[PDB]
Amino acid sequence: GGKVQIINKKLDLSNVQSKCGSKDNIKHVPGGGSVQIVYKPVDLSKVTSKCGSLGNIHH
Amino acid sequence: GGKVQIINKKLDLSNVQSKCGSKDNIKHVPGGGSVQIVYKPVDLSKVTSKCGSLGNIHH
Amino acid sequence: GGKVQIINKKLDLSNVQSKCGSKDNIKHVPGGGSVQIVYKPVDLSKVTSKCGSLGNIHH
């Protein structure tokens, strides 16, 4: 058959926080969570594929 | 047959927070959750596919 | 047959928070939930597909 694959994976911000079996005392704690900021992102890409014919031809 | 695949995966902000079996005391805690901000994003991409014929032709 | 696939997955903000079997005391806690803000997003993309014929032709 013949495949053409063009794959763009750009911006990924992942954040995995876990606590298990915690028997603790917490007092006066700022900034314990999570923050994700993306500021003024411009995504100006071009993707072309000048391709021939596909499928089945008989003569 | 013949495939053409063009895939753009751009902006992904994932956030996974979990707590299991927590037997704890929490006092005066700011910023424990999660924040996701995207500010003024401009997505100005072009994707073309000048392609031939597809399917089945007989002569 | 012959496929053409053009896929744009752009902005994804996911947020998964879970608590299991929690036997705890919580006092005076701001910002425990979740926030998702998208500010002034402009999505100005172009996608073309100058393609040939599809299907079945006989001569």
Numbering used by the authors:
A (entry chain B), B (entry chain A), C (entry chain C): 272 to 330
Describing publication, verbatim:
The ordered assembly of tau protein into amyloid filaments defines a number of neurodegenerative diseases, also known as tauopathies; they are the most common proteinopathies of the human nervous system. The physiological function of tau is to promote the assembly, and possibly stability, of microtubules. Our results show that heparin-induced 2N4R filaments consist of a mixture of at least four different conformations, whereas heparin-induced 2N3R filaments mainly adopt a single conformation.
Snake filaments have a crossover distance of 650 Å and vary in width between 40 and 100 Å. A pronounced offset of the centre of the ordered core from the helical axis explains the sigmoidal appearance of the filaments in projection. The structure has a helical twist of −1.26°, an overall resolution of 3.3 Å, and a clear separation of β-strands along the helical axis. The ordered core of the snake filament comprises residues 272–330, i.e. the last three residues of R1, all of R2 and most of R3. In the core, there are six β-strands, three from R2: β1 (274–280), β2 (282–291) and β3 (295–298), and three from R3: β4 (305–310), β5 (313–321) and β6 (327–330). Four of these strands form two stacks of cross-β, with β1 packing against β5 and β2 against β4. A broad, hammerhead-like arc, harbouring β3, connects β2 to β4. Most of the positively charged side-chains are exposed on the filament surface, where they face diffuse external densities (indicated by yellow arrows), presumably corresponding to negatively charged groups of heparin.
